[PDB]
Amino acid sequence: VLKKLDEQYQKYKFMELNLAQKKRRLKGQIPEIKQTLEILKYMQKKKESTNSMETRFLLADNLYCKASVPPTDKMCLWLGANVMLEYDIDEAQALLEKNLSTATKNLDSLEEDLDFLRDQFTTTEVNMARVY
Amino acid sequence: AFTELQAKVIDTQQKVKLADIQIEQLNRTKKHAHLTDTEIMTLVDETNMYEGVGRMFILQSKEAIHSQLLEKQKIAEEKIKELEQKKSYLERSVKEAEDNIREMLMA
Amino acid sequence: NLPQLEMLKNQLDQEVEFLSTSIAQLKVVQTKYVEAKDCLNVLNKSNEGKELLVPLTSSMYVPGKLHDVEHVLIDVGTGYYVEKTAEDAKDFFKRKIDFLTKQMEKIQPALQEKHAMKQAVMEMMSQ
Amino acid sequence: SAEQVIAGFNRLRQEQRGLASKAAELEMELNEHSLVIDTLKEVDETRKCYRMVGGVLVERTVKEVLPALENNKEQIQKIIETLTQQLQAKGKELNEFREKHNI
Amino acid sequence: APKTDMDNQIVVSDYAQMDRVLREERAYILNLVKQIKKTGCNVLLIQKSILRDALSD
Amino acid sequence: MEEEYIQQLCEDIIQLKPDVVITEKGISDLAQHYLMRANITAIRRVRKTDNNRIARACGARIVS
Amino acid sequence: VEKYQQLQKDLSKSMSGRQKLEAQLTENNIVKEELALLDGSNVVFKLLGPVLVKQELGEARATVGKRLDYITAEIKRYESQLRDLERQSEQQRETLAQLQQE
Amino acid sequence: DQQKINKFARNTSRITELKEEIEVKKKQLQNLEDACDDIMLADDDCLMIPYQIGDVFISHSQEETQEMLEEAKKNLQEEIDALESRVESIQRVLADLKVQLYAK
């Protein structure tokens, strides 16, 4: 019967592509935190204060203060929940590297969990559209 | 005549609205502006307290950081009056032009 | 016939949406110039040499020692940067706000005008 | 009253779509809660910590961080849940009354 | 440099197009300028910019 | 502040105690409305020729 | 019909980049004032490419002028391509419209 | 549906992502290339070039600020190739999933 597969591929693909949608969101969170350390990494110079180099302080997107950076070896980091925490060059090197693949994998299964909801939304609807 | 007396009731009823929630927002802004003081006031002396507005957080001493921040409280406390003053004045205006609509109708 | 009056109503709905958005955003973009204006008052105040915690990258914040409070940027031109005096930078912030201000301003004259004409079409609608 | 069932059937046909609209939204908020508790228990409490609040970055002890970090995190999940709940609890009326109104 | 769409060398339907080739026009006109003083001109007679292509000021 | 200047003059107008004020120079949508709020009938959209007729109606002049 | 659209399509396409030039052009003038204003009072910076080069004052103004100029030229680029892409649509319209119809 | 129907649709959609990522890695490689020219264009040894690392712009002679980009260039170049033949790889499956749809 054509009536089943027809109502199905629709309501497979609705929730299906949502997963291809809900797949790619989290690999979208990778480059944010992937580029992070690399910035710190070109910065990190060991046995030196990290960011000891030449800099121009970013106050805003209009104003900058060209300034002599070198601080203590630390990176104050954003943990969310309005708690900033002050890490050092390694914790940072760790914390921020950790946040990379946590964006990488949430791609997979968050797509996957509804990948059988795409079918269950589907198969629930195909009887639901036919018999009703 | 009436049109200019119609025009003030419209210009009021639209602009009387916003000031009413505007005072409300600042009453809120007074709070964290005060509360963001207490949280660093909670640390009795902290010079690794960073007062900063945006992205940059510059190191300062909590003291003037608080002196700012009871004013920031106050500043965020302030316009509520103006924003209540702007409020109460307009409701008085909408009926005036509403009246000279009606009395000049009757005359 | 029947759809044409149906067409221009929600048409003029969105111009309201667009302009209210544009003034909102041109209420937004102005706000950061005084930000660039005010952050310079702070750096003058505390001193060159205070620890600055500036963002490094996503969730990353990087420290630094304050220097050159008189050396402060104006971003203008297409791709160009003029670092300016502590005085000068705060000026063009104020400027580019005011450039944006009437830019922001006339939006609501454009904003408010588009709704009543939707209404005028919505008036004819229920007519 | 034929406006009820086709609304109900669709309101029964909507929410199985509406799972993702909830599962995608909360996930956008759920992605944040992970970074909240974890790197805390990753980092020591031995050092200083910040709290980032209105117009002010308050240096605040890690002992203040954990409660500011952990408590409200547990609290946020309640409302964001109920948030999308009423998003799709609002439409059912909209699906109910439009049938009544637009029939 | 030759006048292309105004006085100088541009090809763009898009900014990537313009930002890449903008390297070319800017530098050489400076060089062609350079060589003139390199050719020992203390004064320069430039006949009319119509008797010219143009001189970018 | 538009209110005050109307009144302070219209109170100067009230200083001569009218009801009818035929308003020629300085006519304002607030001017009659205040006078109409003053319950002083303020006759606007009017000629100074009328007011010259009125300058000869009370035998008066018109006052800057 | 699709043939009519690409020409409409590429029209506003290459129209898009040509406009924002003028705002850049506008700020190119805005910086000239400041490049006439700066003696280099505070460090002058071109930024082109992911590098931020050391920039000097005197080379910056002729640059932004060229930048002004180069951009100013780019009003003409598509204003050629405007009528180009504008025309090829119109030509096919009455055809493709009627082609859509019958 | 069928499994092919679920696989054939997912493959073309997985052809989509794989061709996406091939593309994006040219233009940094282009602009990093472009940037190697712009530092080279002015103030090289004669003046001191900050190379942009986040907000800290490392000031030195000319060579590295190009070579810095080159490091950002080198990796980005050779990433393009893996996803190139993978579209090529996954399209064969699709082109194989194409005929698997019709024969049955």
PDB file of N, CA, C and O in Angstrom, chain B residues 14 47-48 50-51 53-61 64-65 68, chain C residues 35 38-39 42-43 45-47 50-55 61 66 112:
ATOM      1  N   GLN B  14      -0.497  56.997  24.010  1.00  0.00           N
ATOM      2  CA  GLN B  14       0.622  56.177  23.566  1.00  0.00           C
ATOM      3  C   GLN B  14       1.830  56.352  24.478  1.00  0.00           C
ATOM      4  O   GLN B  14       2.471  55.370  24.868  1.00  0.00           O
ATOM      5  N   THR B  47      41.239  43.373  46.467  1.00  0.00           N
ATOM      6  CA  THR B  47      41.846  44.145  45.393  1.00  0.00           C
ATOM      7  C   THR B  47      41.997  43.348  44.104  1.00  0.00           C
ATOM      8  O   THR B  47      42.260  43.939  43.053  1.00  0.00           O
ATOM      9  N   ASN B  48      41.820  42.027  44.150  1.00  0.00           N
ATOM     10  CA  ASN B  48      41.605  41.238  42.945  1.00  0.00           C
ATOM     11  C   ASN B  48      40.141  41.248  42.549  1.00  0.00           C
ATOM     12  O   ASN B  48      39.743  40.533  41.627  1.00  0.00           O
ATOM     13  N   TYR B  50      37.696  42.971  40.393  1.00  0.00           N
ATOM     14  CA  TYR B  50      37.793  43.732  39.159  1.00  0.00           C
ATOM     15  C   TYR B  50      36.478  44.438  38.907  1.00  0.00           C
ATOM     16  O   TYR B  50      35.487  43.810  38.521  1.00  0.00           O
ATOM     17  N   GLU B  51      36.469  45.747  39.100  1.00  0.00           N
ATOM     18  CA  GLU B  51      35.367  46.530  38.584  1.00  0.00           C
ATOM     19  C   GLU B  51      35.622  46.740  37.108  1.00  0.00           C
ATOM     20  O   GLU B  51      36.643  47.308  36.715  1.00  0.00           O
ATOM     21  N   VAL B  53      33.028  47.249  33.335  1.00  0.00           N
ATOM     22  CA  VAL B  53      31.668  47.362  32.833  1.00  0.00           C
ATOM     23  C   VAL B  53      31.435  46.269  31.800  1.00  0.00           C
ATOM     24  O   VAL B  53      30.587  45.392  31.989  1.00  0.00           O
ATOM     25  N   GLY B  54      32.195  46.303  30.714  1.00  0.00           N
ATOM     26  CA  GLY B  54      32.049  45.335  29.654  1.00  0.00           C
ATOM     27  C   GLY B  54      33.072  44.224  29.697  1.00  0.00           C
ATOM     28  O   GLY B  54      33.483  43.761  30.766  1.00  0.00           O
ATOM     29  N   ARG B  55      33.467  43.791  28.501  1.00  0.00           N
ATOM     30  CA  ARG B  55      34.443  42.735  28.286  1.00  0.00           C
ATOM     31  C   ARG B  55      35.655  42.853  29.196  1.00  0.00           C
ATOM     32  O   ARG B  55      35.883  41.970  30.029  1.00  0.00           O
ATOM     33  N   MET B  56      36.435  43.909  29.034  1.00  0.00           N
ATOM     34  CA  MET B  56      37.510  44.251  29.946  1.00  0.00           C
ATOM     35  C   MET B  56      37.014  44.291  31.383  1.00  0.00           C
ATOM     36  O   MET B  56      35.971  44.871  31.692  1.00  0.00           O
ATOM     37  N   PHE B  57      37.774  43.659  32.272  1.00  0.00           N
ATOM     38  CA  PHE B  57      37.631  43.955  33.686  1.00  0.00           C
ATOM     39  C   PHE B  57      38.976  44.400  34.229  1.00  0.00           C
ATOM     40  O   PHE B  57      39.895  43.590  34.382  1.00  0.00           O
ATOM     41  N   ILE B  58      39.071  45.689  34.529  1.00  0.00           N
ATOM     42  CA  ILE B  58      40.288  46.303  35.032  1.00  0.00           C
ATOM     43  C   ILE B  58      40.350  46.049  36.527  1.00  0.00           C
ATOM     44  O   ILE B  58      39.313  46.009  37.199  1.00  0.00           O
ATOM     45  N   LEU B  59      41.555  45.843  37.038  1.00  0.00           N
ATOM     46  CA  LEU B  59      41.720  45.719  38.475  1.00  0.00           C
ATOM     47  C   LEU B  59      41.517  47.076  39.128  1.00  0.00           C
ATOM     48  O   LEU B  59      42.021  48.095  38.649  1.00  0.00           O
ATOM     49  N   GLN B  60      40.737  47.089  40.201  1.00  0.00           N
ATOM     50  CA  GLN B  60      40.594  48.262  41.051  1.00  0.00           C
ATOM     51  C   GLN B  60      40.464  47.766  42.482  1.00  0.00           C
ATOM     52  O   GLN B  60      40.457  46.561  42.743  1.00  0.00           O
ATOM     53  N   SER B  61      40.351  48.713  43.403  1.00  0.00           N
ATOM     54  CA  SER B  61      40.065  48.386  44.789  1.00  0.00           C
ATOM     55  C   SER B  61      38.569  48.497  45.045  1.00  0.00           C
ATOM     56  O   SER B  61      37.917  49.460  44.635  1.00  0.00           O
ATOM     57  N   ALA B  64      36.246  52.295  46.029  1.00  0.00           N
ATOM     58  CA  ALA B  64      35.632  53.149  45.019  1.00  0.00           C
ATOM     59  C   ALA B  64      34.732  52.335  44.103  1.00  0.00           C
ATOM     60  O   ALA B  64      33.747  52.852  43.565  1.00  0.00           O
ATOM     61  N   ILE B  65      35.051  51.052  43.930  1.00  0.00           N
ATOM     62  CA  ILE B  65      34.164  50.142  43.214  1.00  0.00           C
ATOM     63  C   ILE B  65      32.785  50.132  43.863  1.00  0.00           C
ATOM     64  O   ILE B  65      31.760  50.043  43.181  1.00  0.00           O
ATOM     65  N   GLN B  68      31.237  53.934  43.436  1.00  0.00           N
ATOM     66  CA  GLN B  68      30.511  53.851  42.174  1.00  0.00           C
ATOM     67  C   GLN B  68      29.148  53.203  42.367  1.00  0.00           C
ATOM     68  O   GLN B  68      28.138  53.676  41.835  1.00  0.00           O
TER      69      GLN B  68
ATOM     70  N   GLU C  35      30.232  53.181  25.763  1.00  0.00           N
ATOM     71  CA  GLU C  35      31.040  52.119  26.352  1.00  0.00           C
ATOM     72  C   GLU C  35      32.513  52.322  26.030  1.00  0.00           C
ATOM     73  O   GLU C  35      33.356  52.377  26.934  1.00  0.00           O
ATOM     74  N   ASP C  38      33.368  55.450  27.895  1.00  0.00           N
ATOM     75  CA  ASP C  38      33.444  55.448  29.353  1.00  0.00           C
ATOM     76  C   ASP C  38      34.606  54.607  29.864  1.00  0.00           C
ATOM     77  O   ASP C  38      35.252  54.975  30.853  1.00  0.00           O
ATOM     78  N   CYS C  39      34.879  53.469  29.217  1.00  0.00           N
ATOM     79  CA  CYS C  39      35.969  52.600  29.657  1.00  0.00           C
ATOM     80  C   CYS C  39      37.296  53.348  29.695  1.00  0.00           C
ATOM     81  O   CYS C  39      38.225  52.941  30.400  1.00  0.00           O
ATOM     82  N   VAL C  42      37.677  55.135  33.094  1.00  0.00           N
ATOM     83  CA  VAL C  42      38.116  54.203  34.129  1.00  0.00           C
ATOM     84  C   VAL C  42      39.621  53.992  34.064  1.00  0.00           C
ATOM     85  O   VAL C  42      40.315  54.026  35.087  1.00  0.00           O
ATOM     86  N   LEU C  43      40.149  53.762  32.861  1.00  0.00           N
ATOM     87  CA  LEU C  43      41.565  53.442  32.723  1.00  0.00           C
ATOM     88  C   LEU C  43      42.437  54.645  33.057  1.00  0.00           C
ATOM     89  O   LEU C  43      43.506  54.497  33.662  1.00  0.00           O
ATOM     90  N   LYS C  45      41.460  56.685  35.304  1.00  0.00           N
ATOM     91  CA  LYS C  45      41.273  56.856  36.739  1.00  0.00           C
ATOM     92  C   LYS C  45      42.211  55.971  37.543  1.00  0.00           C
ATOM     93  O   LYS C  45      42.962  56.465  38.391  1.00  0.00           O
ATOM     94  N   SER C  46      42.190  54.665  37.288  1.00  0.00           N
ATOM     95  CA  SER C  46      42.833  53.742  38.212  1.00  0.00           C
ATOM     96  C   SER C  46      44.341  53.874  38.079  1.00  0.00           C
ATOM     97  O   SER C  46      44.987  54.415  38.983  1.00  0.00           O
ATOM     98  N   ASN C  47      44.901  53.355  36.982  1.00  0.00           N
ATOM     99  CA  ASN C  47      46.093  53.888  36.324  1.00  0.00           C
ATOM    100  C   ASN C  47      46.549  52.925  35.243  1.00  0.00           C
ATOM    101  O   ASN C  47      46.130  51.763  35.224  1.00  0.00           O
ATOM    102  N   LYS C  50      47.192  48.847  36.052  1.00  0.00           N
ATOM    103  CA  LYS C  50      46.191  48.007  36.690  1.00  0.00           C
ATOM    104  C   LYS C  50      45.977  46.744  35.869  1.00  0.00           C
ATOM    105  O   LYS C  50      46.081  46.752  34.639  1.00  0.00           O
ATOM    106  N   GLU C  51      45.689  45.645  36.560  1.00  0.00           N
ATOM    107  CA  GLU C  51      45.370  44.431  35.831  1.00  0.00           C
ATOM    108  C   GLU C  51      44.082  44.615  35.042  1.00  0.00           C
ATOM    109  O   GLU C  51      43.033  44.960  35.587  1.00  0.00           O
ATOM    110  N   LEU C  52      44.173  44.378  33.741  1.00  0.00           N
ATOM    111  CA  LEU C  52      42.989  44.330  32.903  1.00  0.00           C
ATOM    112  C   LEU C  52      42.700  42.884  32.566  1.00  0.00           C
ATOM    113  O   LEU C  52      43.552  42.173  32.029  1.00  0.00           O
ATOM    114  N   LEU C  53      41.487  42.453  32.882  1.00  0.00           N
ATOM    115  CA  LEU C  53      41.006  41.161  32.437  1.00  0.00           C
ATOM    116  C   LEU C  53      40.131  41.403  31.223  1.00  0.00           C
ATOM    117  O   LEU C  53      38.997  41.874  31.351  1.00  0.00           O
ATOM    118  N   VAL C  54      40.653  41.061  30.054  1.00  0.00           N
ATOM    119  CA  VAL C  54      39.919  41.256  28.813  1.00  0.00           C
ATOM    120  C   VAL C  54      39.634  39.868  28.262  1.00  0.00           C
ATOM    121  O   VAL C  54      40.385  38.925  28.547  1.00  0.00           O
ATOM    122  N   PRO C  55      38.550  39.683  27.514  1.00  0.00           N
ATOM    123  CA  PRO C  55      38.260  38.360  26.952  1.00  0.00           C
ATOM    124  C   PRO C  55      39.390  37.933  26.032  1.00  0.00           C
ATOM    125  O   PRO C  55      39.959  38.743  25.300  1.00  0.00           O
ATOM    126  N   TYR C  61      39.117  34.451  28.961  1.00  0.00           N
ATOM    127  CA  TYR C  61      39.413  35.822  29.321  1.00  0.00           C
ATOM    128  C   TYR C  61      40.900  35.906  29.615  1.00  0.00           C
ATOM    129  O   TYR C  61      41.462  35.020  30.268  1.00  0.00           O
ATOM    130  N   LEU C  66      47.682  47.376  32.531  1.00  0.00           N
ATOM    131  CA  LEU C  66      47.210  48.546  31.811  1.00  0.00           C
ATOM    132  C   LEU C  66      48.370  49.442  31.395  1.00  0.00           C
ATOM    133  O   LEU C  66      49.295  49.696  32.166  1.00  0.00           O
ATOM    134  N   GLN C 112       6.497  54.144  13.040  1.00  0.00           N
ATOM    135  CA  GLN C 112       5.105  54.342  13.429  1.00  0.00           C
ATOM    136  C   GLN C 112       4.199  54.522  12.218  1.00  0.00           C
ATOM    137  O   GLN C 112       2.997  54.249  12.296  1.00  0.00           O
TER     138      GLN C 112
END
